[PDB]
Every structure is written in C-alpha cells, then in structure tokens.
Inverse folding.
C-alpha cells in the first residue's frame, strides 16, 4: 500500500490549523503552480524574462515548502503565547478579546 | 487398493528422496507423514530416529538408483517402473554420482537445494505443450529419449507457453548463467512452475543463483540489485554507501539547531 | 542594510553569516524528506566551503554543523570531518611534543 | 499468569481513579500501540508527520 | 549482542559484518575506538599519499 | 490507412495473419488484442512470392 | 546443551534407554557420539533436546 496523499493532506490540515497572515501567499503560489501546469504553452511566447518567471513558478517545490512554514509559525506562536502569559498586552486591537 | 512393500532391486539403491507437490525435495526428521513403497525406508528412518504414519495424502518416497530402470513419462520426475504384481515404483536415475535433485532450465540443467529459491523452471525431462491449433506437441531435453521430441534449447524467452493443464510458463531473457546471473525484464507478468509473478521492465543483478524479479519484495531481499537502466544500476548500488539504512532521519533536530542561533543572536545584541 | 549596520556594533559581520548558514541548513533540512541525496553531498560541500571563512565565524559554523547534521549522517563522514578539522592541531602537537 | 497480568489490570483500574483530561491521550496511545502490532509495517516512505 | 555475527550465507555474513560501519554514530560504546581508528587510518593513508 | 508504417510497442491492437508475429511482438514487451478494425500486418520476405 | 555426563532417553517405542558420554561407566548404554545432529530426542519427563 501507499499513503503519500494522506500524508500531504495531513500536512495541509495541520498548516490550516496553524493559521497565520502568510498562509494566503502560499495558497496563491500553490494555485498558480496548478494553473500553470494545467494549461501552460498557450500564453508563453518570446519575452525570455517571462519564460524565466514561468519556469521559476513551475519548478517551485510547493509540496516540500509547507513543512518549513510549520516550523516558522510554531516559534512565532510560542513567542506570542509566552508574551500573553508572562508579559501581557495593552493594545485592544489584539484578537485576545475571547478571554 | 492398498500399498504393499516390495524388495526388488534393493541392492541397486543408495538412498531415498521425497517428492512433494510434484517436485522432488530433501527429507527432514521433523516431518510426520509420508507415502512409502519401500521397506528399507523404515530402517533408513529408524537409524535417524524417525517415525511416520502411512497415508496417500503425504509426499511420496523415491529411491536413487545407479542403474537405468523404467521409462520416461512426460510431466513426471525420475522414472517409473511397474512391478510384476502391478504396483508402480519411482526411481531417480543418474549419470554421475554427484547428483541430488535436478531441475530443468530452458537451456541447461542446474542442481538446487530448494525449489522456491532456485532458477528452476521445469522439473520434468519431457513436457508436452498445446500448439497453435490446439494439439499436444512433446518436448524433451535429449531427443534420443523419445522419438519426435523437440530440444528444450529451441525455446525462446519472453514468449507465452501453455501446458496441457493450463499452466503458463514465462521466463525472462538472460545473458549470464551460473553463480552470478544478469536478467532483463519487460512490463508483463512472468510465470514459472506453479507460481506466476508480476514484474516491471528493467535489469537486475544477483550475487547468487536465486530467483530474481523486479519488484519491491525482491528488492528488499539481500543480495539483489536492480535498476531501470544500466547506468541507473550503478547509482542505485552506490547510493547506500552514503545514505542511512532506514527512516531514522527524524527532522526534529532543527528546533535544537535553531536554539543555538537564537541564543547567539540574543547574546550578541545584549 | 544601513539600518541593520547601525546596530549590532562590530559583531554584525559575525551575525550575518551565522544567520545565512542557519537559513541554508534549514532549507536543506526542509528538502531532506524527498531528496535523500542531500545529507551526504551537502555535508561534503559545506566541509569544502567552510575553509573560505574567518575563524570567528568558522567556529560557529563548525558548532552548528556538528549540532544539526550529526544525527542523520554516516559515521565515516563525521570521522573524516573530525580528522580534517584536527589535522592542523595534530601537526603542531606532534612537532612540539613528540617529534624526535 | 496471575501476578504477571493482574498487576497491569490493577494499575489500569487505579488509573481511572486518578481521572484527568489527559486520560484520553493515554487511551488513544494504547489503541495505537496495539493497532500497529498486527498491522502497519507498510505504507512506504515519504511524509514526516505520519 | 556484541561479538555475535550472522548472515544468510557465507558471502552475506561477510558483507553484513560491515553493517555497523554505515550505521549512524551512537551505536558502539566501548569498541568505538577501534572502529574509528580502522577508518581514520585508511582515510589518512589513501588521501595523503595517493 | 493504405500506408505502410513502422511498428512500436505503444500500439495495442492489430489484425494478425502471420503466426510468428505473435512471438516477434512479444520479444519487444508488447501485448495486443486481435481486432479486424485495427491496422493489418505484413512480413518482409526476400523470396519473390505472390 | 547436555545437563549431565550420563542421561536416559526414550526410544521410538517409548522404552527407556540409558545414555552417557562413555559406555564403560554403565554396561548396556550407548555413547553420546552416536547421536546425529538436527534430530529430536525425548527423556523420561518429556524434555526435548535437538
């Protein structure tokens, strides 16, 4: 048996659980990669600068980039929790209004 | 009918062998039931401390003999002799003393210790096949044994063959036979005597004469190397020398690695 | 970059390379689960490249490499790294306390 | 045997006396330990959370 | 257990005798010194001379 | 389509007439299903026949 | 493997048969050297040695 797809789905689910402001740019990169891989060819002609951009977008390892985002967000969340517990916040714009 | 014990040709027998599942195999003391036609087998087993119960649903006993006795029947190992009382007997004739159990490859004859892990393709001297029109045509190794037989060497690899009972034979092309073997495969299932297996196209190299096919099951077995191409084979075989032997590479050490960076970054500023 | 150089005093040079090497190692670790070739060849490249650095950042680079890449590298690579690092001191020790 | 098995059952029963919100974590861990004993050893490489 | 070698066949056992050598560091405690020396000598010779 | 062309292992159906083609095509790793609607087969013979 | 210099074993029919390292110490016994390897043997109490 094989379960790579389930592992990727679990990684995406855990990324969605650890929501931050920078998840949208990763989702945009993923959807752009899917769109470029799905049609391609049609609207790429001349403009070597455009060709370089298209190749860079297509060759980006989206499937191996979510995991780095996980560790990037984990430390930020730990720091925010430490500030909330030990030090407190004065700004009312924080989303701590739940408690 | 009830099996009976006979003592004819007793002085011509050196030992005894067992036939299980249509393929001859060695005998072990832990086995409990056999089909026997010889009385000296009782002394053979008793000297080794064995006991057994006679039944027809248990492997048969055949005796190795130094004299050409009986005649060859396609599909049956060894030779078959019928006594004056009508009972049949089985023997294993040989040409040279250094003979155990011999199985037939499409080109040569190679001894084996276990049928499951050997290059064996057929275990019979002569075999019969269904032709294109649906009629039996006999094949044998030595044409002098039976008139009208075709040599086994005329067979070709990667060709589908069907026996009289519906079994399928498919053996891959080879370039070297012996202690070390090299094989080539295609994207089609290959089948041997009683076992059909699925394999992918590629090339495999083995340090032993064991059966080799291109799949994960055989790839996990030791002493087997395979690759998608000749160049890729070298990379595959040299990969483990610089790679761990398992999935122990847990990437959870990065938090500890970045702890030092955070500590030094804070310490420099302070 | 001017604002960054305004702070951290003299140690900004040490901090910059230490951060860059950590980021590169983090990227390599992130690419590890699919590309199994990286742990060996990248370690060899890192060992080759670490010669072209100042000792002040070289010590930090060696400490970081030994902390991070150790649990997922073959033993012989580590022993070769240790021998190559310690030959420069083995020569001095042999010359000054053992040689004739 | 009695002493080699009844002790574990007694410990499990006593564990329920000192109930806490983390008891379900141990309950799930016990299921996981037995599940990947008669199964698993498969699903090949790739991914890291699993 | 230390001092015990095994393999499928004579050649397989000889090849598997070197299995701990490709194992990640942290597998031997007392006999690590001779294993390290057996690699250090080969490496230093094969590099520094040849 | 009235035009002779080379053969490749990608094709999957032919109208077979010659018996030895079944053995020749197998050596290239291909398999096919016999259907008369698929392109026919021909053999190259040095001898003047037909 | 062997517990004592002299032992006792059951035959194929279950009758007791004495055994020892040397036959001279017990008349009618059979030496250990005649025992073949990879063979099951049984004692008075049903212990199995191979």
């Amino acid at each position: 048996w094989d379960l790579t797809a389930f592992g990727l789905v679990a990684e995406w689910f855990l990324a969605y659980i650890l929501f931050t402001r920078f998840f949208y740019v990763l989702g945009l990169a993923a959807i752009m990669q899917l769109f470029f891989s799905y049609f391609a060819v049609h609207f790429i002609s001349n403009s070597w600068l455009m060709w370089l951009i298209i190749n860079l977008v297509q060759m980006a390892p989206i499937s191996a980039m979510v995991r780095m985002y996980i560790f990037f967000a984990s430390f930020y969340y730990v720091w925010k929790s430490y500030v909330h517990v030990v030090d407190g916040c004065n700004s009312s714009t924080c989303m701590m209004c739940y408690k | 009918h009830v099996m009976s014990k006979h003592t004819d040709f007793s002085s011509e027998i050196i030992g005894y062998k067992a036939i299980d599942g249509g393929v001859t195999r060695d005998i072990a003391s832990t086995d409990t039931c056999f089909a026997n036609k010889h009385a000296d087998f009782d002394t053979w087993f008793s000297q080794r401390g064995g006991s057994y119960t006679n039944d027809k649903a248990c492997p048969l006993i055949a005796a190795v003999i130094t004299r050409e006795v009986g005649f060859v029947v396609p599909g049956l190992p060894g030779t078959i002799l019928r006594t004056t009382n009508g009972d049949f007997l089985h023997f294993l004739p040989r040409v040279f003393s250094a003979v155990g159990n011999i199985c037939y490859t499409p080109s040569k004859l190679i001894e084996y210790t276990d049928f499951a892990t050997s290059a064996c393709v057929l275990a019979a001297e002569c075999t019969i096949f269904k032709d294109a029109s649906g009629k039996p045509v006999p094949y044998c190794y030595d044409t002098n044994v039976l008139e009208g037989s075709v040599a086994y060497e005329s067979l070709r690899p990667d060709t589908r063959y069907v026996l009289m009972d519906g079994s399928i034979i498919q053996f891959p092309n080879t370039y070297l036979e012996g202690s070390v073997r090299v094989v080539t495969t295609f994207d089609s299932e290959y089948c041997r005597h009683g076992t059909c297996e699925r394999s992918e196209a590629g090339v495999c190299v083995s340090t032993s004469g064991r059966w080799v096919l291109n799949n994960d099951y055989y790839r996990s077995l030791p002493g087997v190397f395979c690759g998608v191409d000749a160049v890729n084979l070298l990379t595959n075989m040299f990969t483990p020398l610089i790679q761990p032997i398992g999935a122990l590479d847990i990437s959870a050490s990065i938090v500890a690695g970045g702890i030092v960076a955070i500590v030094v970054t804070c310490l420099a500023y302070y | 970059f001017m604002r960054f150089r305004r702070a951290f005093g003299e140690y900004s040079h040490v901090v910059a390379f230490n951060t860059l090497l950590f980021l590169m190692s983090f990227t390599v670790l992130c690419l590890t689960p699919v590309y199994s070739f990286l742990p060996g060849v990248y370690s060899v490249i890192y060992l080759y490249l670490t010669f072209y650095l100042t000792n002040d950042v070289s010590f930090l680079a060696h400490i970081q490499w030994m902390v991070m890449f150790t649990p997922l590298v073959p033993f012989w690579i580590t022993i070769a790294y240790i021998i190559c690092i310690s030959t420069k001191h083995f020569y001095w020790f042999f010359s000054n306390y053992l040689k004739r």
